[PDB]
Amino acid sequence: SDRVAQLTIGNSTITTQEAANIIVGYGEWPSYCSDSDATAVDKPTRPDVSVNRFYTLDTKLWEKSSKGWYWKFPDVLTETGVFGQNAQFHYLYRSGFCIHVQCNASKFHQGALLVAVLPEYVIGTVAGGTGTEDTHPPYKQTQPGADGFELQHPYVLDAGIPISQLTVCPHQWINLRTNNCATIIVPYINALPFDSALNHCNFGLLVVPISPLDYDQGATPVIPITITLAPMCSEFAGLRQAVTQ
Amino acid sequence: GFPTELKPGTNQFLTTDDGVSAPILPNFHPTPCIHIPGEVRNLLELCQVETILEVNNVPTNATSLMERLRFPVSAQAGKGELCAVFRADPGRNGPWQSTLLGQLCGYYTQWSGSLEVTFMFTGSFMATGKMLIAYTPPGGPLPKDRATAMLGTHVIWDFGLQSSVTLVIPWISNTHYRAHARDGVFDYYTTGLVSIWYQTNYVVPIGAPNTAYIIALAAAQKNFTMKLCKDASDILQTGTIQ
Amino acid sequence: GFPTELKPGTNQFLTTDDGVSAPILPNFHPTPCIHIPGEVRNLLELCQVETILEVNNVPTNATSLMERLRFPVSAQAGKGELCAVFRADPGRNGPWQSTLLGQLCGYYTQWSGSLEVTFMFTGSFMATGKMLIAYTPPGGPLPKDRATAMLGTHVIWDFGLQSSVTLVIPWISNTHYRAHARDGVFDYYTTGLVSIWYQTNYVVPIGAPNTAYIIALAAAQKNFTMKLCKDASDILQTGTIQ
Amino acid sequence: ATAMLGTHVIWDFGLQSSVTLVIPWISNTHYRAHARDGVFDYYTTGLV
Amino acid sequence: GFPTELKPGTNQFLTTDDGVSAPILPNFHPTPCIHIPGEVRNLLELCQV
Amino acid sequence: SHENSNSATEGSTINYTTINYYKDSYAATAGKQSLKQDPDKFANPVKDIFTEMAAPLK
Amino acid sequence: SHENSNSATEGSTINYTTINYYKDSYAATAGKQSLKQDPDKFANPVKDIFTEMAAPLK
Amino acid sequence: GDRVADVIESSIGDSVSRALTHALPAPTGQNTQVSSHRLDTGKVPALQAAEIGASSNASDESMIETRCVLNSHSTAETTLDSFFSRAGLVGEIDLPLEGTTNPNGYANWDIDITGYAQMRRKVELFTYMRFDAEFTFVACTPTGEVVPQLLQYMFVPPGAPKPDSRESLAWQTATNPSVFVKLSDPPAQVSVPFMSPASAYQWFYDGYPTFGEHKQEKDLEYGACPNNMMGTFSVRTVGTSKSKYPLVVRIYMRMKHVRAWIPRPMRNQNYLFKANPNYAGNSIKPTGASRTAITTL
Amino acid sequence: EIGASSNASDESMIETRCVLNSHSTAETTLDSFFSRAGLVGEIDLPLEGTTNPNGYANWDIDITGYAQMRRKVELFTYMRFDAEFTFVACTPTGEVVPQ
Amino acid sequence: LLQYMFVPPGAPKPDSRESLAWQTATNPSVFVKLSDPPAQVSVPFMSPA
Ligand SMILES: CCO/N=C/c1ccc(OCC[C@@H](C)CCN2CCN(c3ccnc(N)c3)C2=O)cc1
Ligand SMILES: CCO/N=C/c1ccc(OCC[C@@H](C)CCN2CCN(c3ccnc(N)c3)C2=O)cc1
Ligand code: NA
Ligand code: NA
Ligand code: NA
Ligand code: NA
């Protein structure tokens, strides 16, 4: 009765029988931009059901040695369905998201993943190892698209900051003996009312094992982690031709 | 005396400090102010006045300078050909520098508002035609054809008794204000592009010129404001002015 | 002029002085402030958020750093064996440095309040067990056995559906505030010790892992406050930052 | 990834042994005749 | 600025001067004062012992 | 302050809020000016004003 | 003081008590801030709030 | 007009962001209430489910028997202004006589306070910050000696001409704000407003400033947000001939009227560059101290 | 041809949303634009020289010798104003001497 | 020109005239010339007792 849940939005429904409640980031729900916060004058377009729905974008395999992954929003969706098309045809975009990370196992497997959302997740490089070289992350690393990207140094989140403090950001844990999913609702976060869905990634989704996956020989060894997400209150403005980047 | 304590800033001369200074001529009274036409109260008043936009900013020799004030149109081959293009950035090097809006803009770091360009056709009365004028918001590259430009904000202009048409370049920005745009990271603040296409064709009967010109006038909309006062990019002096 | 007399302090620049300074841009108005989620008003707000406590602060090679985020438990021999220990001093070198509480703590000379550490068991669902977590107030040496640790403040944790348990380290001090504790005379301000013991045993059936880990999360209670603002002990730069 | 773009349900095994997929009425006509290969495929309901 | 004129005594440091000096730790609050026996208020109190 | 009225803006269609310590008002600060505007004086000085919707020449 | 409203905190959910001698409010002192706090925004952003006494997962 | 039901009943357009939490006054630490022994079934405060993502709600009163404590310890020194409104070094400008750097009697410093770790680590605790600031300029020779030299500081906003010499026409400073001061005078000091085109400055921008292909050669622009670039600070010795003294100008900043959003993990690796979070990969160090065993102090 | 500027607005050329614009117009007033001190004169009093080697100098009050300031004022034909004058003096090296 | 800085227990003590600690981002510092009058500040009661 807090362990069970149903998420319905658009023409999509998600069910879970081992949930751990729902997190509403920074304590507030997604909402459309008000007339006083807005600055752009064209009347926006709010597609509703055709874009605010659940998209299942990717599946990763959790292994005893996995270091962790991250995805960028709205990057993961810029090339998917009707949401992607609007993001490409418009200069301005804004929305929130309902993120549902899925991972189930058996009562004999163990392990815990930390699922967190970190706004403005700027990636850094190891600087040629010695730190004397000002190298920079390539486009495929800063905006990895739907496949996501694997962390090289999870302890410092590939950005010189302690993952041990990542819990100061909206999160949930997927601890196999307890739940099989994490659900986080995130409002629009930015210093501007609208922005480019292409040039700016508002936040990153981090899925990192903190307690390694373990099980005895004989138990199903393939333990997938699937990422499903839904845009909420999507708004678009500044129409012209489609642009991919 | 009364106990005081001097704080940092003491003795400094800040050019924008608004203070009180001793008056040199005590009990002096200025000549009264009679009525004089044309008093201006705010620079924004001048920004709403259209001045000529040098869209055709290509000729550079003294004898051809006047040609920058107008661009041409003439009979084509009906393939929706391109007539002209230019960036909408008002405080950027290019056509807008010819306008009073552009120049005033130079004295401010940031601006915000919609712009408007009114095009006046000066061909003969017997000349007709339909043009498509488009505004492409940031992110959209220079339209390769009329079909692509047509996807953005536009106006379809029909020549007739009303010699002119107005293209409004609405404020479509991610930020509340834009700083002056230029090549590099500051292109973040670009306003976009404006392109003029032939919707049908410039048509004329026997006896009338096959080429005519269009004059472009530009100014700001009433929601336009500027902030963060700064010095203009130019200094019109080489040596000492004697 | 009006009779004044300068007092000591005149002309000095005190970095924490809260005064008035002439404004460089007169009549300037900032971009309005739109709504942005997650505004923080007091650092104390962040101190009540649990962050991972590196109880297992022993591995140091890059490839093993993540192992500090968790410690283990496994089947024993029923002799109430010791699982782990650590000092409760939040602003002291040790496990607390990994937490956001510990780090914020570094910007203050004195603190006061109760702390809390929540332990989350991440073994398989089929694993059971009972642990005794104890807090030993100042003066008590590291408990030699479970019988000795049991004499202080403690919690007996039973694994089950609720994966976690909270050990409250109540404020038990002689002074209203404690300064950061360290070896030497400042140990006067130590908070005490925390030790984890096997109350019964980690039990598991055929088919489940014999070793599982526990993750520790720590934060401050609502009566926690800090005073006397100071610079943190670290300065994260070697040469000039280019 | 392609199937996910249409109407769907994500089913999680647990105490409730079953899940229901509703195939909502999404047709151009008010009624459909029996569908079969050929022109009558006009009345097909779709795929699951 | 407002017209002032410095008088003698300016810049001097008189050890018994009772003035105001900028505070080094803004918004700082001292540890509260609990009750402690034997508070003395005037040296004359001790002179009668 | 009972001073002289020797400012350049004494008798202006815009009132100012200034500071001063002298008997002559021109010694005062610039203060704040009134935010009135009249674009029409320059952008639309036509005798017979024409509406937006209409055709300017009819 | 009838000044300009150009402070970074004009229109804040916390009122300040400041000193200033200029027409621009950002020139003012830092003053004192309001002592309101909202830990829950970070420490407890759950949709369905769970009591202390109860079992968090039931 | 509207008529189909789904349109009349939709929530499309609701600009009122519903908030699950609200702030409360908390001028002092919470008090402690008397508590006694509880031996109940059903009631279990000590048990939590950290998976939910919330922090423990367990309190002293429910874990041990407590006495009453009237806590009057203030929470005032942990406000944003208390923490940030302390001036720190954020810039240093050298004006040497004999040199490789600025031997021409003038210098241009891009306004970027990320070159000093103490200040930088404090501000990077938050993602967005909006504030006014008081800037103080301390000048002397490299020995800390005070010399009778006149200087000119000028703020050159983006788009204004940057001086290219001690005698540049730009120093006429007809619109830019300038400060003229002697090293013999106290440190110059002014108030600066919040000047960004955005509603807040942001210490992290996960994106690019422009559209297009983001090829290798342009990757230095990843993370560059013009909304944070306020301009240039120019300084010169006021004269047509070289100064007689070598000078140094230290720049201090004291934020005031601060607001901040989105707290984040605090830097735990040395900083290398102003423009990014790059860390030395061969020296990834633990956040704090280590020990030999988990069962030993 | 009439001589007036376009009266067309955003609302009539495209479909617009509502925007409550609170951007100030305060910094574009005449005082905001002009009440910023700029250089308008320079007077040399050298020891060895061709100009004013006699320890005195007469400067005709004319602020048109410097382009920055001049270009701003010449935007208008007539101007009425009070003014605050500041005099900065030093040696040609910017050194301060007891004179 | 001199710099005075108050380093509370736990803050890094400068170990040189060029120590990074002189950035004084949180500690209170006073910058003053010997030519200026004596520097002077107010200190609160700071004990934990
Ligand atoms: C005579 C005239 O005297 N004029 C003095 C004067 C002083 C200061 C001044 O502007 C101060 C600007 C600071 C308040 C904020 C600096 N900021 C904003 C965020 N940011 C960032 C963000 C992300 N990455 C990096 N690297 C940097 C950054 O560095 C202008 C003029
Ligand atoms: C101890 C006593 O300290 N005394 C100081 C002091 C300062 C200034 C001063 O008078 C200032 C006069 C200026 C305010 C206006 C100068 N103006 C008017 C318009 N004009 C023009 C117009 C058309 N062509 C040219 N070339 C120039 C021009 O140059 C008198 C005395
Ligand atoms: Na962008
Ligand atoms: Na004065
Ligand atoms: Na000051
Ligand atoms: Na004093």
Provide the residue ranges of all domains of chain F, joining segments of one domain with +.
1-58
CA nearest to G45 within chain A: A27
C38 touches chain G (CB under 8 A): yes
Beta strand ranges found along H58-184 (DSSP E):
88-95, 106-110, 126-140, 150-156, 178-182
Q: Give the separation between CA A57 and CA A34, rounded to whole angstroms.
A: 31
Amino acid at residue number C237: Q
In DSSP notation, A113-161 reads: EEEEEEES------TTTTS-S-----HHHHS-GGG-EE-S-GGGTTTTS
Handedness of CA A190, A191, A195, A199 (dihedral sign): negative
Residue G15, min C-alpha distance to chain A (Å): 22
* Cβ(H272)–Cβ(C241) below 8 Å: yes
Residue H248 token pair: 């140094």
Q: Give the separation between CA H203 and CA H127, rounded to whole angstroms.
A: 6
The SS3 assignment for C52 reads strand
* Cβ(C206)–Cβ(C174) below 8 Å: no
Backbone dihedral angles phi then psi of residue A138, each to the nearest 5 degrees: -70, 160
Q: How many CA atoms lie within 13 A of G46 on its CB side?
A: 23
Q: How far apart are the first and last CA of chain B?
A: 51
Q: What is the dihedral of CA I51, I54, I55, I57, to 10 degrees?
A: -50
| Interchain contact, A15 vs D15, CB within 8 Å | no
Nearest atom in ligand 1 to the alpha carbon of residue H135 is 7
Q: Give the separation between CA C190 and CA C89, rounded to whole angstroms.
A: 6
Residue whose CA lies nearest to ligand 2 atom number 19: I62
Alpha-carbon distances of A204 from A72, D39, H53, rounded to whole Å: 4, 49, 17
Residue E48 token pair: 């009668």
Per-position b or e across E20-49, b if 16+ CB within 10 A of its CB: eebbbbbbbbebeeeeeeeeeeeeeeeeee
Alpha-carbon distances of C70 from A111, A166, A210, rounded to whole Å: 11, 15, 7
* Cβ(H241)–Cβ(I92) below 8 Å: yes
**C-chain residues within 8 Å CB-CB of H256?**
18
* Cβ(H189)–Cβ(B8) below 8 Å: yes
Helices (H) and strands (E) in chain F, counts: 1, 0
Amino acid at residue number G49: I
Backbone dihedral angles phi then psi of residue H172, each to the nearest 5 degrees: -65, -20
* Cβ(C2)–Cβ(E4) below 8 Å: yes
Q: How far apart are the first and last CA of chain G?
A: 59
Q: Give the separation between CA H269 and CA H283, rounded to whole angstroms.
A: 9
* Cβ(A27)–Cβ(H21) below 8 Å: yes
**Which residue of A37, A153, A175 is in closest CB contact with C35?**
A37
Instruction: Give the other-Cβ count within 10 Å of H297's Cβ.
Output: 11
| Interchain contact, B177 vs I23, CB within 8 Å | yes
Residue I35 token pair: 């009440």
* Cβ(A77)–Cβ(A177) below 8 Å: no
Instruction: Give the other-Cβ count within 10 Å of B69's Cβ.
Output: 16
Q: Locate tokens 């709030």: which residue?
A: G49
Beta strand ranges found along C7-76 (DSSP E):
13-14, 39-40, 51-52, 71-74
Strands H201-202 and H126-140, how do they pair?
A: antiparallel
Q: What is the dihedral of CA I70, I71, I77, I81, to 10 degrees?
A: -50
Alpha-carbon distances of C39 from A192, H71, H203, rounded to whole Å: 15, 27, 15
Alpha-carbon distances of F33 from A64, F23, I25, rounded to whole Å: 71, 22, 11
The three-state (H, E, C) secondary structure of H110-130, written as one string: ECCCCCCHHHHHHHCCEEEEE
Q: Give the separation between CA H274 and CA J8, rounded to whole angstroms.
A: 29
Task: Give bridge partners of residue A12 from the DSSP assignment.
Answer: A9, D8
Beta strand ranges found along C141-237 (DSSP E):
153-158, 164-169, 178-179, 193-198, 211-220, 225-229
B139 CA to middle of ligand 3, Å?
10
Task: Give bridge partners of residue A171 from the DSSP assignment.
Answer: A116
Handedness of CA A86, A90, A91, A92 (dihedral sign): negative
Alpha-carbon distances of A169 from C46, C66, C215, D44, rounded to whole Å: 11, 19, 18, 48
Q: Burial of H48 by CB count in 10 Å (0-12 exposed, 13-18 middle, 19+ buried)?
A: buried
Nearest atom in ligand 2 to the alpha carbon of residue I83 is 14
Strands B164-169 and B115-121, how do they pair?
A: antiparallel
Residue A204 token pair: 């990153």
Amino acid at residue number D48: V
CA nearest to C24 within chain I: I36
* Cβ(H207)–Cβ(A200) below 8 Å: yes
Alpha-carbon distances of F42 from B47, B102, F55, rounded to whole Å: 10, 17, 21
* Cβ(A113)–Cβ(A207) below 8 Å: yes
Q: Among B145, B152, B187, which Cα is nearest to B167's? A: B152
Beta strand ranges found along B21-175 (DSSP E):
51-52, 71-74, 82-87, 108-112, 115-121, 130-136, 153-158, 164-169
Q: Among I23, C93, C139, H61, which Cα is nearest to B175's? A: I23
Backbone dihedral angles phi then psi of residue B193, each to the nearest 5 degrees: -120, 155
Question: How large is the C-alpha radius of gyration of chain F?
Answer: 20
H54: DSSP letter = P
Q: Locate tokens 């103080």: which residue?
A: H136
Q: Among A121, A120, A236, A231, which Cα is nearest to A186's? A: A231
B30 touches chain C (CB under 8 A): no
| Interchain contact, E11 vs C9, CB within 8 Å | no
Q: Give the separation between CA A116 and CA A151, rounded to whole angstroms.
A: 14
Residues constituting chain B? 242
Q: How many CA atoms lie within 13 A of A98 on its CB side?
A: 22
Q: Locate tokens 């006397």: which residue?
A: C228
Amino acid at residue number D29: T
Q: Among H13, D24, H17, which Cα is nearest to A13's? A: D24
Q: Give the separation between CA C34 and CA F54, rounded to whole angstroms.
A: 39
Backbone dihedral angles phi then psi of residue C35, each to the nearest 5 degrees: -80, 135
Cis before A74? omega within 30: yes
| Interchain contact, H45 vs G6, CB within 8 Å | no
Q: Among H123, H201, H272, which residue has the most ligand 1 atoms within 8 Å of its CB, making it the best to mutate?
A: H201
Backbone dihedral angles phi then psi of residue H203, each to the nearest 5 degrees: -80, -5
Q: Give the separation between CA A225 and CA A219, rounded to whole angstroms.
A: 17
Query: What is the resolution in angstroms?
Result: 2.8
Q: Give the separation between CA D24 and CA C76, rounded to whole angstroms.
A: 58
C12 CA to middle of ligand 6, Å?
10
Backbone dihedral angles phi then psi of residue J21, each to the nearest 5 degrees: -60, -20
Please work out whether the CB of residue H133 comes within 6 Å of at least one atom of ligand 1: yes
The SS3 assignment for F27 reads helix
Q: H1-297 has which CATH code?
A: 2.60.120.20
| Interchain contact, B168 vs I13, CB within 8 Å | yes
Q: Taking a contact as any Cβ pair under 8 Å apart, which residues of chain B between 173 and 202 contact chain C?
A: 175-177
Instruction: Give the other-Cβ count within 10 Å of H221's Cβ.
Output: 17
What technique was this entry resolved by?
X-ray
The SS3 assignment for H109 reads strand
Q: Give the separation between CA B193 and CA B88, rounded to whole angstroms.
A: 5
* Cβ(B5)–Cβ(J42) below 8 Å: no
Q: Among A86, B14, A223, which Cα is nearest to H137's? A: B14
Question: Any idea which architecture G1-58 has in CATH?
Answer: Irregular (4.10)
Residue A67 token pair: 């270091």
Angle at CA of residue C27, ends C23 and C30, nearest 5°: 85
Question: How large is the C-alpha radius of gyration of chain I?
Answer: 24
Contacts of C17 (CB under 8 A, 6+ apart): B7, E22
Residue I35, min C-alpha distance to chain H (Å): 9
Range(s) of the domain holding residue A9:
1-245
Residue A46 token pair: 């709010």
Handedness of CA E1, E3, E9, E14 (dihedral sign): negative
Q: Give the separation between CA D46 and CA H60, rounded to whole angstroms.
A: 61
Range(s) of the domain holding residue C236:
1-242
Q: Give the separation between CA D21 and CA B35, rounded to whole angstroms.
A: 83
Q: Give the separation between CA E10 and CA J32, rounded to whole angstroms.
A: 17
Q: Give the separation between CA C62 and CA C57, rounded to whole angstroms.
A: 13
Task: Give bridge partners of residue B117 from the DSSP assignment.
Answer: B167, B218
Q: Give the separation between CA A99 and CA F14, rounded to whole angstroms.
A: 57
The SS3 assignment for H219 reads helix
The SS3 assignment for A55 reads strand
Contacts of H130 (CB under 8 A, 6+ apart): C33, G8, H194, H199, H200, H201, H258, H259, H260
| Interchain contact, H89 vs J23, CB within 8 Å | yes
The SS3 assignment for A84 reads helix
Alpha-carbon distances of C214 from B22, C128, H290, rounded to whole Å: 76, 13, 19
Residue B142 token pair: 């220079």
Please work out whether the CB of residue I62 comes within 6 Å of at least one atom of ligand 2: yes
Q: Give the separation between CA B149 and CA B156, rounded to whole angstroms.
A: 12
Beta strand ranges found along H18-125 (DSSP E):
24-25, 47-48, 88-95, 106-110
Residue C214 token pair: 């526990």
**Full strand arrangement of the beta sheet holding C225-229:** C178-179, C108-112, C225-229
Q: Give the separation between CA I56 and CA H220, rounded to whole angstroms.
A: 57
The number of folded domains in chain C is: 1
Residue B143 token pair: 């339209």
G45 touches chain A (CB under 8 A): yes
Handedness of CA I52, I57, I61, I67 (dihedral sign): positive
Which stretches within chain B are classed as H helix?
A: 43-47, 100-105, 146-149
* Cβ(H26)–Cβ(H79) below 8 Å: no
Residues constituting chain C? 242
The number of folded domains in chain A is: 1
Residue A126 token pair: 């190891």
Instruction: Give the other-Cβ count within 10 Å of H248's Cβ.
Output: 17
Instruction: Give the other-Cβ count within 10 Å of C223's Cβ.
Output: 20
Contacts of B218 (CB under 8 A, 6+ apart): B50, B51, B52, B53, B96, B99, B101, B115, B116, B117, B118
Strands A5-9 and H24-25, how do they pair?
A: unpaired
Alpha-carbon distances of H69 from C227, E36, H32, H72, rounded to whole Å: 19, 18, 5, 9
Residue H100 token pair: 């490789």
Alpha-carbon distances of B135 from B166, B195, B216, rounded to whole Å: 12, 7, 15
> In the structure, do chain A and chain I come into contact, i.e. share 3 or more CB pairs under 8 Å?
yes
List the shell of residues around ion ligand 5, using CB closer than 5 Å. Answer: B 7, 9; C 21; H 189
Q: Give the separation between CA C223 and CA I97, rounded to whole angstroms.
A: 61
Phi-psi region of A218 (alpha: psi -120 to 50; beta: other; left: phi over 0): left
Q: Give the separation between CA C163 and CA H52, rounded to whole angstroms.
A: 11
Q: How many CA atoms lie within 13 A of B104 on its CB side?
A: 28
Q: Give the separation between CA G24 and CA C152, rounded to whole angstroms.
A: 60
Name all contacts of H33-37 with Cβ < 8 Å and 24+ positions apart.
H33/H61, H33/H66, H33/H68, H34/H66, H34/H67, H34/H68, H35/H60, H35/H61, H35/H62, H35/H64, H35/H65, H35/H66, H36/H65, H37/H65
CA C142 to chain centroid, in Å, comes to: 20
